[PDB]
Amino acid sequence: KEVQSDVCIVGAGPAGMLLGLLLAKQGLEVIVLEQNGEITQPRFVQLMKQLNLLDYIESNSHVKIPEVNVFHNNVKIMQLAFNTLIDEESYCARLTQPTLLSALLDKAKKYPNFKLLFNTKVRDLLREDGKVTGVYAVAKPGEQINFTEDEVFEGNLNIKSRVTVGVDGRNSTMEKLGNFELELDYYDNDLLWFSFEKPESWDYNIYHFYFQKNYNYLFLPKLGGYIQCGISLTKGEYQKIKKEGIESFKEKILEDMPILKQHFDTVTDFKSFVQLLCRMRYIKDWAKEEGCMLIGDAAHCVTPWGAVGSTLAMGTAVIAADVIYKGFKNNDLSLETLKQVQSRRKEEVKMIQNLQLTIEKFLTREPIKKEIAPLMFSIATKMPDITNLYKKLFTREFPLDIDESFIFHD
Amino acid sequence: KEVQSDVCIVGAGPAGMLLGLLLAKQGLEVIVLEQNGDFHREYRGEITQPRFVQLMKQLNLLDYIESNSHVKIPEVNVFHNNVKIMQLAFNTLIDEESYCARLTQPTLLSALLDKAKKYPNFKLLFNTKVRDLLREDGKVTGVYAVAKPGEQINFEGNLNIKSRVTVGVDGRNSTMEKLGNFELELDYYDNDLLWFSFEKPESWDYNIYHFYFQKNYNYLFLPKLGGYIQCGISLTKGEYQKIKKEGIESFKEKILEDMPILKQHFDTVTDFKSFVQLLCRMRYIKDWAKEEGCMLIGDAAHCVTPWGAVGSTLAMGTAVIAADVIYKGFKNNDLSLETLKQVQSRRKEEVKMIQNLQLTIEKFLTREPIKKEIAPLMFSIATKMPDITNLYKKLFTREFPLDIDESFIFHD
Amino acid sequence: IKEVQSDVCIVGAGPAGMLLGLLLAKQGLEVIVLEQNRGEITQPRFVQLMKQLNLLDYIESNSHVKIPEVNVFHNNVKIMQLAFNTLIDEESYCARLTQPTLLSALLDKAKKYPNFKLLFNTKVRDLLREDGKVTGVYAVAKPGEQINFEGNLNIKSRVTVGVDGRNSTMEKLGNFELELDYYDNDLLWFSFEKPESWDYNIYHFYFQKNYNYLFLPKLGGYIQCGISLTKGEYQKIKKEGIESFKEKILEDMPILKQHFDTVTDFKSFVQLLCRMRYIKDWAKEEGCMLIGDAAHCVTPWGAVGSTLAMGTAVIAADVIYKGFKNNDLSLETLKQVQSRRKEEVKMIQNLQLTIEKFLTREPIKKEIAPLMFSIATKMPDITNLYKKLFTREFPLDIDESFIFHD
Ligand SMILES: Cc1cc2nc3c(=O)[nH]c(=O)nc-3n(C[C@H](O)[C@H](O)[C@H](O)COP(=O)(O)OP(=O)(O)OC[C@H]3O[C@@H](n4cnc5c(N)ncnc54)[C@H](O)[C@@H]3O)c2cc1C
Ligand SMILES: CCCCCC/C=C\CCCCCCCC(=O)O[C@H](COC(=O)CCCCCCC/C=C/CCCCCCCC)COP(=O)(O)OC[C@H](O)CO
Ligand SMILES: CCCCCC/C=C\CCCCCCCC(=O)O[C@H](COC(=O)CCCCCCC/C=C\CCCCCCCC)COP(=O)(O)OC[C@H](O)CO
Ligand SMILES: CCCCCC/C=C\CCCCCCCC(=O)O[C@H](COC(=O)CCCCCCC/C=C\CCCCCCCC)COP(=O)(O)OC[C@H](O)CO
């Protein structure tokens, strides 16, 4: 087959869904290819009001989290209310990606200009003329999209689409295909997830972090009146942890957090946990060719602290959407103009990563630094200039300068 | 009235009394002059240090001293918002016997005097204010004392005590400093301690060395003789006057907010007349022996801030070295300035390394708006450092015994 | 006029540039040095590098003072001490080695080889190539000096290297990009007569109440002192007047009363800007490359400056010779220099950023910086960081021909 949809978007993640909808509202016939966190930041609310999409997003079900609290040995040592960072709307929210992804498509399917092909593993299809034409995708039945007529193409397809963007995600095959380079690749700690019944004593819209004797815990609201917890461990510590047996692991967890005694009286194995790798990649040059460019997690994946991940990629997509809409508005979509995305996001993307690196330094479990890290954190948050850090970690100082046409008027 | 004597010790404090006793066992006829009648005149505190236990063992006096009433304090505990952040047992500092004790000064002063009146070689004239009496030969012969009725150990009007070497142990508030034309190299005063005692609750123990970092104030808790607990509230110089202006009601409210177990005691507190304000003064004299036949030691020379219970035993330690200088000074008839200036040459190392250590500790008592919240966190971090035990040993114990003539040991 | 060709041009005769030419004269390529006309202390990385090139004895013959250890003070009380011999099993120490002595010593062993050439007092403009490459440079000369080889000249010499330094004009000519540009603090330098109380081979840093001080040995029995100030604070200091500034300095460091009993103005001080740069792509064209301070200038803490650029120049000299073993000295091969130094350069800089955070003078952070430094130096893993700051784990793998046989 041969599809000529002017632009192809590899990956149907939250960054891509925003790239297509902001380009389908422009007119460019885009084709999205998909092979198949829950907490948002005040940066997310700023972006949605910027495009006047907040009410549309806020219409769905979501739980607003008003503040972060950090404890040490079951005593509070830090408290920040997000409403106190910027004068505009500012808060964290429990908004699952399926909820946000479908709401973004519900307003995107109404525009036949876009097209998304679900359950389609995609290989590469470059161009011989010193550029990239598109990709080659081995499909699989099941999709609606906007170019099917109930027929589409349930097999091999060639989509020659001029400029090809890579938003596959953290586990991206597009990193290698484009012959890119990872300037920074970070991974030191894991998060061991598990849910439990929220006790009558606790609240629900919670962003709680605990520095306890044996492990450090992260608590978030889980959709359904439950609380999802994440224990922070060193890279490789989980394997050693399973060897010592569930009885010792439970005895240590209940020693730190005695309120989880009821929940772990039923836990008898390690099959209830979920290990997640807190990696953090960075690509040296996001646009190294003509018609080829990397954005999103494929370029600037980050650690989960601060809820920066989901909303940081989206912000880069919006700037790319302004370069792409302005790139066809001046007929300059070459390498020199496509690389302007990274030249505009370098400031915010790097400052966030370094700050994430500094935050990660508190998760150390080496024998002497471990005992003083909570005490250090309490001192750190008590500095005069801590509020600048909170503003830099959670909010944007100025809105993204884009074409006024990107605002959704009603 | 004229009286002669081998050595005159102005002031009968724990350093002055220990100096005389170590000299009556030597033979030198000493005369001690104290302006107060009985030993229990000034409070002067009641808590001793492991250094005190080691120095008494050097003189084979530990059993004689421990014979009296005393309460042994086995460990120090530091809390932050009523949560323990530090704990140290003095028995783990040195392999020998090591502990703090609640031993009142009148008890120790009378116990030392009971072994000194038995030697007719000594003499203490209680209730005798002492003015100055220099020597015409570019030196000091003794002192001139305006006496008063009191006790006697071996006159009732003007008296001149010309006794060659005259020691000044007058104390922190010493008149000897100005008479001898001395010089203060270091003069420190930053904080006050507001003392008050209360009935020990059933919840607490008694032999306690507890320091609390609370929201409003910091509290020190120690055993008070009689089963009570004496508390000291830490204030900055001049803050008390401001507190009294705000009234006992606001102050009691703030104390109870930090220490709710004191509601019982404060249901009876209705004014500030129940507290005792104490000035944490620390001083250091540049040259302790600047003339011939005259000397300062003890608190008159190097008084220190209370933390660690170093004060009594640090002054007594300098008195013990002074007793070694005078005993070997009469054994060679060399009691000149070059020989009397040897005391400071032997005490400078330990006295300066403790005074500077005190300065660091006092820095945790800061009450400025942001540093106040970080001083407990800083304290918790330091006490979790690998080499912290070296500091505890330096603060509470002596590494080696004071090298003195073997004749100073009290029999066996 | 005078379209001189030659084989290679190195713009800038800095410590990095000079060593690059001498490592090429032992190879054979006729090099041309261009100079238009700074840190007297080197680190143990320097001793490791000179042993690799068998040059240690050659420098140690010259005048130099070996500094064996750092001491960090807080209110005149020592809170850290580290001896460099305890870092690597080989020879390891700091030294006071003035740049004129090291720069001339490299030239005394380079002038003996007629293969090299350095044109002193020559401002250099650009001279690209019309065929999508770089031929050389255009230099407006002046009365200067001569090397073993007087008006406008164009030197088209295939590969042209930029070692101009921190104040580099060739950064702009090559259309380069600064990935990182840092500048937060200044150092106010002044020297004084070493008191009888002090030593000489000193690497002393003091956390005091008013200012933070650095003490280093000054060539000639004096001590050179550097006061740390925030960007723009010097201007504010001078308005307050020299009397106040001297009073505050003597408050921090009363031993300087004698030296400052004669100071009556600010003309005796020398302000230095602690800048730090990093170029995203060190070789972005064909035949054009930036190394040294022109590419990765760094802050003075640890004496990393001189020895770090030379390390990059040495790898660059090996890339050119091993690139000529296949005669592939194109952009794909010239990008090999940055691909081999990225790991070590980006680690020294990040450490320097963290070190620099201890120089903060903001109202609350200022009192706790000495306290934070003291804790960090007491960590179990501190010796590891000292190794990464002061020494290189393994010598640079280069052609065996680079060793100077006696
Ligand atoms: C309120 C308070 C509490 C303390 N608590 C403690 C504690 O818990 N632990 C601890 O280790 N230390 C404590 N100290 C320190 C301790 O009191 C001294 O460190 C110790 O007593 C050494 O004193 P000294 O003999 O050098 O002088 P002092 O004990 O001050 O000398 C007092 C004697 O000097 C006499 N005298 C004074 N002036 C004259 C004069 N002009 N002529 C003649 N005689 C004179 C007095 O009459 C009296 O006999 C405390 C001090 C105070 C003020
Ligand atoms: C709190 C009042 C006392 C109450 C109980 C009294 C009895 C016993 C407690 C004694 C504990 C004393 C702990 C002191 C630890 C400390 O500072 O030592 C340090 C331990 O190691 C460190 O450097 C740890 C980091 C610094 C810790 C704090 C230093 C002192 C500062 C206090 C000010 C805190 C308030 C906040 C100010 C800043 C706010 C921005 C130095 O010891 P060293 O090995 O270098 O040798 C000793 C040195 O020579 C001493 O000068
Ligand atoms: C002061 C200038 C230096 C003068 C002498 C120069 C010579 C030698 C000194 C060399 C050693 C300097 C000490 C550096 C200690 C240090 O940072 O160690 C680090 C560990 O500590 C850190 O990461 C420190 C982070 C930055 C500290 C900034 C200084 C804070 C001080 C004052 C401002 C107060 C605001 C913050 C207070 C609360 C802190 C939590 C390296 O180990 P790591 O675990 O991070 O692993 C390595 C990783 O790759 C990161 O590097
Ligand atoms: C802990 C998990 C997250 C819990 C809450 C989740 C969400 C959000 C909260 C994020 C808060 C992050 C606070 C980090 C503050 C921080 O380090 O900032 C830094 C402060 O400077 C530093 O780099 C301080 C040290 C960073 C931490 C180093 C490691 C400390 C922890 C454990 C090891 C202890 C031994 C080593 C100590 C080394 C000396 C510092 C920003 O730099 P700055 O000085 O220019 O900024 C000052 C700032 O304005 C006020 O501090």
Cβ-in-10-Å burial (0-12, 13-18, 19+) of B24 comes to buried
Say which residues have a Cβ less than 8 Å from residue A403's Cβ, sequence separation at least 6. A322, A325, A326
Closest CA to A94 of A65, A136, A56, A53: A65
- Asked if the Cβ–Cβ distance from C368 to A379 is below 8 Å, we say yes
In whole angstroms, give the CA distance from residue B59 to residue B53: 10
In A15-144, the DSSP E strands lie at 30-33, 39-40, 63-65, 67-72, 76-81, 92-94, 116-117, 121-127, 131-138
Q: By the 8 A CB rule, do C5 and C29 touch?
A: no
At C228 the three-state DSSP class reads: strand
Phi, psi of B387 (to 5 degrees): -90, 20
Closest CA to A38 of A82, A91, A92, A94: A94
Type and span of the H or E element at C60 = helix C56-61
Closest CA to C192 of C165, C217, C222: C222
What are the tokens at B295? 């000397």
Q: Is the CB of B386 under 6 A from ligand 2?
A: no
Name the closest ligand to CA C353.
3
CA–centroid distance, residue A382 to ligand 4 (Å): 11
At C193 the three-state DSSP class reads: strand
Q: By the 8 A CB rule, do C225 and C192 touch?
A: yes
Q: Are strands B218-224 and B209-213 parallel, antiparallel or unpaired?
A: antiparallel
Beta-bridge partners for A230: A193, A218
In whole angstroms, give the CA distance from residue A174 to residue C103: 49
Phi, psi of C209 (to 5 degrees): -65, -50
Q: By the 8 A CB rule, do C39 and C300 touch?
A: yes
Alpha helices by DSSP H, listed for A180-308, are 237-244, 246-256, 261-264, 297-300
| Residue C18 to residues B279, C77, C278, C313, C335, Cα–Cα distance (Å) | 67, 41, 21, 9, 22
What are the tokens at C85? 């011999």
In whole angstroms, give the CA distance from residue B335 to residue B327: 10
CA–centroid distance, residue C228 to ligand 2 (Å): 26
In whole angstroms, give the CA distance from residue B11 to residue B290: 19
What are the tokens at B190? 């930053």
Residue count of chain A: 410
Amino acid type, B310: V
Q: By the 8 A CB rule, do B152 and B32 touch?
A: no
Closest CA to B102 of B59, B40, B36, B52: B52
Q: Among all chains, which residue has been given the structure tokens 């039945």?
A: A141
Per-residue burial over B326-362, b if 16 or more Cβ lie within 10 Å, else e, is: bbebbeeeebebebbebbbebbeebbeebbebbbeeb
Q: Are strands C31-34 and C8-11 parallel, antiparallel or unpaired?
A: parallel
In whole angstroms, give the CA distance from residue A167 to residue A12: 7
Q: Is A182 left (phi over 0), alpha (psi -120 to 50) or beta?
A: beta
At A276 the three-state DSSP class reads: strand
In whole angstroms, give the CA distance from residue C282 to residue A178: 21
At B67 the three-state DSSP class reads: coil
Chain centre distance of CA A80: 22
Strand order from edge to edge, sheet including A39-40 = A39-40, A92-94, A63-65
Closest CA to B14 of B109, B146, B96: B109
Q: Give the relative orientation of helices B342-362 and B388-396 as an angle to the nearest 10 degrees.
A: 130
Residues of C in contact with B381 (CB under 8 A): 375
Domains defined for chain A, CATH in brackets: 7-66+90-183+279-364 (3.50.50.60)
For chain B, the distance separating the N- and C-terminal CA atoms, rounded to the nearest angstrom, is 41
DSSP H helix total and E strand total for chain C: 14, 18
B384: nearest CB among A371, A379, A384: A371
In 3-state terms chain A splits into helix, strand, coil percentages (rounded to 5) of 35, 25, 40
For chain A, the distance separating the N- and C-terminal CA atoms, rounded to the nearest angstrom, is 39
In whole angstroms, give the CA distance from residue A340 to residue C28: 43
Q: Among all chains, which residue has been given the structure tokens 């092909």?
A: A117
Alpha helices by DSSP H, listed for A289-330, are 297-300, 309-329
Residues of chain A contacting C, Cβ within 8 Å: 183, 284-285, 366-369, 372, 379, 383-385
The dihedral sign for the CA sequence A14, A16, A18, A20 = negative
What are the tokens at B407? 């004749």
In whole angstroms, give the CA distance from residue C19 to residue C23: 6
In whole angstroms, give the CA distance from residue A234 to residue A213: 15
Q: Chain B to chain C, count of Cβ pairs less than 8 Å apart?
A: 13
Strand order from edge to edge, sheet including B124-126 = B124-126, B30-34, B7-10, B165-168, B294-296
In whole angstroms, give the CA distance from residue C18 to residue A360: 42
Tell me the resolution in Å: 3.1
Other residues' Cβ atoms within 10 Å of the Cβ of residue A343: 13
Radius of gyration of chain B (CA): 22
Q: By the 8 A CB rule, do A298 and A283 touch?
A: yes
Q: Is A236 left (phi over 0), alpha (psi -120 to 50) or beta?
A: left
At C247 the three-state DSSP class reads: helix
- Asked if the Cβ–Cβ distance from A366 to C380 is below 8 Å, we say yes
Q: Is the CB of A383 under 6 A from ligand 4?
A: yes
| Residue A102 to residues A33, A34, A337, C370, Cα–Cα distance (Å) | 16, 14, 32, 54
Name the closest ligand to CA B374.
2
Say which residues have a Cβ less than 8 Å from residue C203's Cβ, sequence separation at least 6. C41, C67, C69, C70, C71, C94, C215, C216, C303
At B99 the three-state DSSP class reads: coil
Q: Are strands B276-285 and B228-236 parallel, antiparallel or unpaired?
A: unpaired
Q: Are strands A292-294 and A163-166 parallel, antiparallel or unpaired?
A: parallel
Closest CA to A2 of A133, A123, A109, A115: A133
Closest CA to B378 of B394, B398, B360, B396: B360
In whole angstroms, give the CA distance from residue A327 to residue C297: 36
Strand order from edge to edge, sheet including A216-222 = A76-81, A67-72, A208-211, A216-222, A226-234, A182-197, A274-283
Amino acid type, A31: I
Q: Method used for this model? A: X-ray
Residues with CB under 6 A from ligand 1: B 10-16, 33-36, 43-48, 129-130, 169-172, 175, 278, 298-299, 306, 309, 311-313, 315
What secondary structure letter does DSSP report for A260? G
| Residue A364 to residues A189, A231, A253, B297, Cα–Cα distance (Å) | 9, 13, 18, 51
In whole angstroms, give the CA distance from residue A370 to residue B359: 29
At C197 the three-state DSSP class reads: coil
- Residue-wise DSSP of A170-209: SS-SHHHHTT--EEEEEEEEEEEEEEEEPPTTS-SS--EE
What are the tokens at C89? 């099993």
Per-residue burial over B236-251, b if 16 or more Cβ lie within 10 Å, else e, is: eeeebeebeeeebeeb
Name the closest ligand to CA B381.
2
Query: In angstroms, what separates the C-alpha of B370 from chain A's closest C-alpha?
Result: 8
Say which residues have a Cβ less than 8 Å from residue C358's Cβ, sequence separation at least 6. C369, C372, C373
Residue count of chain B: 412
Amino acid type, A333: L
Q: By the 8 A CB rule, do B220 and B193 touch?
A: yes
Closest chain C residue to the Cα of A342, Cα to Cα: C179
B370: nearest CB among C364, C371, C380: C364
- Asked if the Cβ–Cβ distance from B385 to C367 is below 8 Å, we say no
What are the tokens at B209? 């060395």
